[PDB]
Amino acid sequence: QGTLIRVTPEQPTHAVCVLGTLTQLDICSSACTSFSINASPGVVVDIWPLEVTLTMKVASGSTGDQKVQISYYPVKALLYLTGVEISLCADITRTGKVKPKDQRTWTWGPCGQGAILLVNCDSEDLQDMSLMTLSTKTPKDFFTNHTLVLHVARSEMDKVRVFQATRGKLSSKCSVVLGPKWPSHYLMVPGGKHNMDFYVEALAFPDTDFPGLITLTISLLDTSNLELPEAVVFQDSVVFRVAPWIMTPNTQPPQEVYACNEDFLKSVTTLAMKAKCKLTICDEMEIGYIQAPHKTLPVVFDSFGYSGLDSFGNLEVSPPVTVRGKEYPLGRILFGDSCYPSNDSRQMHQALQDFLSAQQVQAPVKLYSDWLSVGHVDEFLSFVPAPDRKGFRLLLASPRSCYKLFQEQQNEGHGEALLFEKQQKIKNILSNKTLREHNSFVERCIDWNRELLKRELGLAESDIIDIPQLFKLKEFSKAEAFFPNMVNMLVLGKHLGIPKPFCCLEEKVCSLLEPLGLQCTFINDFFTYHIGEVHAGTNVRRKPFSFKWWNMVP
């Protein structure tokens, strides 16, 4: 914020003083007993026997507008000063309004500052990009021996792109000033009062190689001498943070439902109309969003912009929750992995894991799901809205809850009932000593993740509801749903779309969810076998959190 001016009695020196910067006066370097200083009314002097600082009232109308005299004894030293205004303004307040300490630090929190960029993936496009403005109030003859340059570091040049508005708020594809080939650009700025606009976009999300910060700097160069290299008289910069990709949980109000089978769509359209949300007809993707003060856009990841564990079916997120003081307003991303690494065990690709962490707003949690033949966490866990407590309920698949249901059917006298209507008897399933040992192991696997979710999400038992579900053993001792899993249901607010288990099973599940004020409608064919993968029924785009991610302190 400081500049040092060294004056000398032999020759009057010229200097530029940018409004908003502390200007220091050097005296003893070229001086003698005492000194006295008299200046112009437009120059403020505050400090005499032999530190002096200068403050400008306003901008200059001509070169050498103001002056300062240094009397030492008595020989006088002259100083012709030029006060100019240079300010690179952006949305540092995050209130959607552009405003001109510290300016070189991006800070999390409500009492913090720092602008936000959106990832890109005509005025129509300009409504997405961020806006920074440059204000210059200089003498009319100032830029004959001075020049400004906007620049970004070579490491961040490919992560960002800056445009210059040619006519008003419009621009062409040739008006680029900063990009993955142009680390810097010389600005053509006229004398007098002039404000030019810049439109900035991000080219990449935060990652393990890119923390998510982009600094754009303006520099004032002195070009009064042809023989000597350019001299930096002043530098100002604004720090941009690239907005993270944020996942939305089932507790967030739905907006649009997608589906892809005959009697299936009828029950879906019924539920969508009851919850009053859009449904369009035309599983390996996740529909999140990016949020900026000016605009908020839906983003879909898969491969409205855009092993067996690398899928996004293994990607889930919890409702807002507070864990041991630490608050997670956007919830926590949940995904599956093995307990310990081995040659036969699999894990999510490290690139995908690190990407989730880069978006610090939803601190990921490694769960145990390697036991499942598919391996996705949504096979044994889910979330539903609740009127009381923390406002939600964690749904876990439970072989014990289902075995208790069957064992009482024998007690009631309904042990002759058959399912899958190859069909099998309920008495045979209960008497099946082999199946009981399998579900006992499956129960154990879920019980581990149960305590994991109770710990990392800070949950009590009064926040968990066990959904009766049976599991069998596929090849390589892997687990698999015995019947269509209820837990992987479709949540549309207070209107559920639980898969039909093929009823006594349906009767119990409702008794667990209906007291929460939930409407249970079962679907004949939620899941369909594609020949050799099982595909999910639908997909939902839900309303982004009211909580602004930048106000969070990871």
CB of 72 to a copy of itself, least distance (A): 15
Of 91-99, 106-114, 387-395, 445-453, which part binds a copy of itself (CB under 8 A)? 445-453
Residue 439 φ/ψ, nearest 5 degrees? -65, -25
C-beta of 376 vs 393, nearer to ligand 3YZ: 376
- Residues that bind ligand 3YZ in the complex, under the rule CB under 6 A: 283, 313, 374, 376, 378-379, 480-481, 483-485, 488, 527-529, 534, 536
CB of 232 to ligand 3YZ, least distance (A): 23
CB of 149 to a copy of itself, least distance (A): 6
Rounded distance between C-alpha atoms, residue 549 and residue 248, angstroms: 12
Rounded distance between C-alpha atoms, residue 483 and residue 534, angstroms: 13
Contact of residue 3 among ligand 3YZ, a copy of itself, Ca ion, none (CB under 5-8 Å per partner type): a copy of itself
Q: Is 276 left (phi over 0), alpha (psi -120 to 50) or beta?
A: left
Contact residue for a copy of itself among 55, 217, 255, 410 (CB under 8 A) = 217
- Residues that bind Ca ion in the complex, under the rule CB under 5 A: 125, 128, 313
Contact of residue 347 among Ca ion, a copy of itself, ligand 3YZ, none (CB under 5-8 Å per partner type): a copy of itself
Rounded distance between C-alpha atoms, residue 381 and residue 393, angstroms: 11
Rounded distance between C-alpha atoms, residue 182 and residue 178, angstroms: 5
Measured CA to CA in angstroms, residue 410 lies from 100, 403, 504 at distances of 76, 11, 12
**Interacting residues of 167 by C-beta distance below 8 A, sequence separation 6+:** none
Contact of residue 269 among Ca ion, a copy of itself, ligand 3YZ, none (CB under 5-8 Å per partner type): none
Contact of residue 444 among ligand 3YZ, Ca ion, a copy of itself, none (CB under 5-8 Å per partner type): a copy of itself
Cβ proximity of 95 and 102 under 8 Å? no
* Number of shown-chain residues binding a copy of itself (CB under 8 A): 53
Rounded distance between C-alpha atoms, residue 152 and residue 404, angstroms: 65
Measured CA to CA in angstroms, residue 521 lies from 60, 271, 347, 495, 527 at distances of 74, 8, 35, 8, 15
Q: Which residue lies nearest ligand 3YZ, judged by its C-beta?
A: 313
Residue 157 φ/ψ, nearest 5 degrees? -75, -30
Under the binding rule (CB under 8 A), the answer on residue 46 touching a copy of itself is no
CB of 88 to ligand 3YZ, least distance (A): 35
Residues forming a β-bridge with 365 = 334
* Total Cβ atoms within 10 A of residue 387: 10
Rounded distance between C-alpha atoms, residue 501 and residue 524, angstroms: 9
Q: What is the DSSP string of 369-412?
A: -TTBSS--GGGTEEEEE-SSTTSEEEEEEEHHHHHHHHHHHHHH
Under the binding rule (CB under 8 A), the answer on residue 225 touching a copy of itself is yes
Of 126-134, 259-267, 342-350, 511-519, which part binds a copy of itself (CB under 8 A)? 342-350
Under the binding rule (CB under 8 A), the answer on residue 389 touching a copy of itself is no
Q: In degrees to the nearest 10, what's the CA dihedral of 107, 109, 110, 111?
A: -50
CB of 467 to ligand 3YZ, least distance (A): 12
Of 69-77, 385-393, 434-442, 488-496, which part binds a copy of itself (CB under 8 A)? 434-442
Under the binding rule (CB under 8 A), the answer on residue 441 touching a copy of itself is yes
Interaction site with a copy of itself (CB under 8 A):
1-4, 6, 29-30, 51, 149, 151-155, 157, 183-184, 208-209, 217, 219, 225, 227-229, 231-232, 235, 339-342, 347, 350, 368, 371, 400-401, 404, 437-438, 441, 443-445, 447-448, 450-451, 454-455, 461, 477
